Design a protein around this ligand. Sequence first.
Ligand code: HEM
Ligand code: HEM
Ligand code: NA
Ligand code: NA
Lengths: 713, 713
Amino acid sequence: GTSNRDWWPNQLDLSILHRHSSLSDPMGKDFNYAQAFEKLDLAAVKRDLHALMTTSQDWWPADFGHYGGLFIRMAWHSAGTYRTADGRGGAGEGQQRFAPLNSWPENANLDKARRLLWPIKQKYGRAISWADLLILTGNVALESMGFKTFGFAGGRADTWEPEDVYWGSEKIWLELSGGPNSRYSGDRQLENPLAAVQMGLIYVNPEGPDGNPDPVAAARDIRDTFARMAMNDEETVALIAGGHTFGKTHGAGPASNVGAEPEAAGIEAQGLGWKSAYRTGKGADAITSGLEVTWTTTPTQWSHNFFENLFGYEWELTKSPAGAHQWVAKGADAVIPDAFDPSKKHRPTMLTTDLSLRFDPAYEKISRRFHENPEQFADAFARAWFKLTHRDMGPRARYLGPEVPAEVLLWQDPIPAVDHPLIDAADAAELKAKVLASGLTVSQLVSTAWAAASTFRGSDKRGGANGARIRLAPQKDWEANQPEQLAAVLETLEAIRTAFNGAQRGGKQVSLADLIVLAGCAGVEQAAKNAGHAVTVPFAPGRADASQEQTDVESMAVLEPVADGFRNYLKGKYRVPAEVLLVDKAQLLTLSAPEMTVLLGGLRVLGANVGQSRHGVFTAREQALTNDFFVNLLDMGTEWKPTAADADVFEGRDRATGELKWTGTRVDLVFGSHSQLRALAEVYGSADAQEKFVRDFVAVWNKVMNLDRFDLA
Amino acid sequence: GTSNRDWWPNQLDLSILHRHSSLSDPMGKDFNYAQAFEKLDLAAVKRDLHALMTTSQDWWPADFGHYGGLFIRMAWHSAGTYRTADGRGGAGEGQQRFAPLNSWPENANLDKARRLLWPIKQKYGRAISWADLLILTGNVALESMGFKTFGFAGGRADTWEPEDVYWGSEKIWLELSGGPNSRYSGDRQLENPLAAVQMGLIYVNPEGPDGNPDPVAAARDIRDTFARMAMNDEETVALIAGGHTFGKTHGAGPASNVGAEPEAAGIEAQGLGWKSAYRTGKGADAITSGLEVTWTTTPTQWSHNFFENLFGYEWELTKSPAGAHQWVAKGADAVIPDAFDPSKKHRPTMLTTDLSLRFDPAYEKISRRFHENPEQFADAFARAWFKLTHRDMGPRARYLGPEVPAEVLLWQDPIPAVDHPLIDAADAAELKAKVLASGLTVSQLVSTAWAAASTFRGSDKRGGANGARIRLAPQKDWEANQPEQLAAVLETLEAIRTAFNGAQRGGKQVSLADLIVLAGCAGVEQAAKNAGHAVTVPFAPGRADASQEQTDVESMAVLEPVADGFRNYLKGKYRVPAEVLLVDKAQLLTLSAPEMTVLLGGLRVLGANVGQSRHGVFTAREQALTNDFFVNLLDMGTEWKPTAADADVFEGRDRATGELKWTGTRVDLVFGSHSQLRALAEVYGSADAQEKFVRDFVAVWNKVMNLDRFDLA
Ligand code: HEM
Ligand code: HEM
Ligand code: NA
Ligand code: NA
């Protein structure tokens, strides 16, 4: 059945902006998951999960009579797809249950684990999401096996279709690096935004880099991938040794016995996959990864036996029954229990990637410290586990239920509690007029607010104007934010705020975060008035000002907008065309294509471009809010050609006279080229549309201003 | 970027049910196109279109000084993608402006035609859709050139993304038959639902079948394709000779001069394509098809010269300047004017496909008759043009504006005007009670109403319960409708109706069409009561009963549901898997995935399966409206396997004992296999979902009952 993707494979795909519509959602339009969750008897869910842990089902018998290890792996894979570069992946949307993640090789037999949870999901229904349940099950597995977690927050609403994520360009599952779609270049440099070493892996290859069983080299990949998931060395060691305190791997026979992954299996498999022809295909005969390693003498109980074994033996390279490289303890007794036969025991074994924790010099120090101080190991693992499973959930205001930890952590980008009365409508109007009487222009006001609010990304719910982090390092020094200009605008706004705040009674004050946004709204109102329209831009107060000490400078780095088509900005030259990067940014901002289109057209004519570039500024009334961008873009009396100096800049000349009328980038002209975007541009570029343009612009502006306002949900 | 389509190319694509969401739509949720159109100054639009006709632009100069021919082609391509098999394609959604149709080879340079219309589209804005505009421009071109049209209706609302249409499986533009994805098998048998001979053509190849210039063979393709677009021999001859009374083809130089189609062109092309390196690239040097034919001595005026030339000369095979086969009049003078140079004249020429009209025996008689009786030709062409351009618009109630013809035509599947008082809520309650006291079962009531209503398709807005066409030929004889049983149910309903009607005052009566639907609603209410719920099903009266004479038995044939997954019915063995056919049917019914899911689960347990088949009937309380389908489907205590005798039937057995619990088809089990569908099934199969199931079912039932109710829109 031949499609548009087949005919025109490099044409821009707008469908990623139109997912998660009300059409695909089986819940009412009014369904509020937070409110369903807040009535969940969470204690009763955990008791059921507790019982499930030791209630073996014959279709996937429990190793050692306890599902704990399997469910921990389940919950770590749900969290483990996360990338700090774009915030995509992680546990927060329950995506492990949809394609492609449900069928990745490294997710093999997690289909069994999810199926085991259906009876409990079915019992509690909409009051607990799959997304929350996966994580909660991992916590309960840990608890049942004697490990006290740091806490748990609910709130991850389920989604109903696959997320659109760039996982890599390889066409072969698990392809070794150096192929025609190599995710590596230079000195083993992993391309952004990826955070895994091969297509269909979580982080690294457990045999070692491209299957080469060198723990030292494996450690480099571990450190790189984990850094790309926002985890440092201490956290990494704690997670890997923590996880591999429990359970086992499965490689009881050759991998060629394993059939089709879930998305490729027959209909009769009812959503399960990796059906195995090896002996019983399950339990004692299970094959998952191809490795056959059991790390500890008590795989169903928390202990410090991972590090006792790691350091207490010397290790020899060997092969599993499926031919995978793995390691066995030299001269050891048979001390490790068998998963099904009480009369058999086995020698201690390890993965190459476990040995990384001893043979990398920086990890070795952390590992020794954790070996000598198992209470520090426990505490670090608890904290890292919470971070792992919550890193993509967003501000603490989204956190639900009775196990939310009270400690505020730096990676949460925390925002102080508001401790005073808020400005009211009359105050907002007074502040807007003061902003406009200061002499700040429409362009300055719009640009600064855009810069502050457009750091949000819906992928992990980080960023936005709350916190006023634009005044702090590193945001205040980002090139896209024009640091010298930004500093002068911030200083003027701070004087207005100090004057407003000094005049108040009863403790009422306004935050800089709120005033930045409100100043932007005044800019947009003034632009509308300059075009002859009377509109009020909505504004919701309640943002607070975060401190530098509450702002991790390194974790903020990934929010830098190295491409921002809405300001016609690109920091350098990329492999990816700028229009694709625009659509990527729009998706992170949660915008539809009509939203993206309105917002861009408006921003152009308001002067929001970085460096005051005239590219795409298709108006003779700059700083008035009109649909001139569209009217001019769609004017057939202009002919467009790439410049001689730069193929990515275009000159628009009068077709009759040859006179230069405009310049534009790829991001500008895509709205006149792409057949779906041009259809949208046409709507806003019609003679009846100026009022619609203004109203839709103001709505989308307000939307962007409020993206991080989970205090108002 | 590797996608789910790349990994699992045969997996079912649900995104077709979630297109055209409010997300991709730039108009408000409340935008009503009918109301915008009803305030259009239609007269003013036509005047501007009249002016456009002779206002030549230098970037695509007008042949003979008049764009009429180009615009007629543009309108006839807009209409000409239509397929009677599924109702997809046609002019009614303005899809010519989107991929792929904007870039089909046979639509070359229609991008120029559409761009010529932008200023008028821009001036009238949302009050005239592109879809309406394309057709209206065709009409105006005809009128400008002396041809009186039969009429015009507005109301085709614009769409905002590509429609999901199976156009064929070929991976090469214009691929000749017999390839690895041949749309032909057997004795030149074109696969349903296709209605074109090669990928990227409208109907046939103008050079002849697979490029072989045999007019008699070409005629067979013409007859087959046009029948597949709902046109008979008289209509076909009138359209082809009518259209080719105007304008000319373009093949001034080799086709290798012509560059990328619009979707492949550079961004600076601003949505246009097929840029040509031959001489000026345009006007006198234009290359569109590669053929160079001008049919008449007055290409910009209606005449009877097509048939004078066809019959008045003998024809010789020659080649255009691009190498294409075409025909030239033997021994003729140079009587045909040049499009740009007053000092040149040309011999009459014809396409192979024009000669079909003379050399096919059945067409020849029609052609002679039109030659001898030019008034009959004019009238038939006017009618056929109206049909061509309105065949996919639906019932007359959707027709807008002041040029709607008053004559009622058979292909509009007309329904008589209601001329009596309608039943009220008290009458509805009394009729429902009588239906239930008659002894008709839930299963009969539900099945008959489903059968009546589910012939609707949103592609061309044909079908539905209005008209009570289920009681007429051919619907009453379709195997899916179970003729024996249907006749028994209809006879009982007719007695109820006769008794109700005979008791009324003041002319009040109920139609059979209304009573069928109402009786279905009573069945659903009864089913709900059998499950312990108190449910009133909404009902809107106002359907009327069509006669057999108003119901064309051949055009109804395409509405036969040879696959209806909602009744677990498949008429024979098809190359397309049954779950794909289910999704196809859901798309035609305008159902989202959640709607399809709820609806099918409900229908299964209410006894709507054809032949009383137990496949998918996963309940022990048949004819009670419960979510049993889902709860039993998702039961992991059951293992499923295909049967020995039939790979498309599955047996579900107890995993512990091996006892047979259920059987199901592919359509049943796909809800437990496909990861997105299973996610939906889980919602309805949860412990908290019984009430939600019942209420969502009733909503979707009502939706289906009302699909064709454009009298209420
Ligand atoms: C370098 C990082 C990691 C690698 C390469 C890795 C690799 C693997 C492999 C290949 C398996 C065996 C799958 C099977 O055959 O059943 C597995 C099992 C497991 N891993 Fe990891 N792992 C890593 C990090 C983690 C982390 C961060 C956690 C949790 C905090 C975790 C917890 C587990 C658990 C609990 C199992 C046991 C599954 C069972 O009992 O069925 N691992 N690991
Ligand atoms: C067997 C069916 C038909 C075939 C194979 C066919 C083929 C074509 C071809 C190849 C062209 C030349 C394209 C170009 O080079 O510019 C063309 C032109 C045209 N056809 Fe058809 N045609 C068909 C039916 C129709 C019908 C039903 C209509 C309208 C009622 C129509 C009206 C036109 C007109 C007006 C033009 C001239 C365009 C211009 O002047 O620019 N044709 N036809
Ligand atoms: Na994410
Ligand atoms: Na259609």
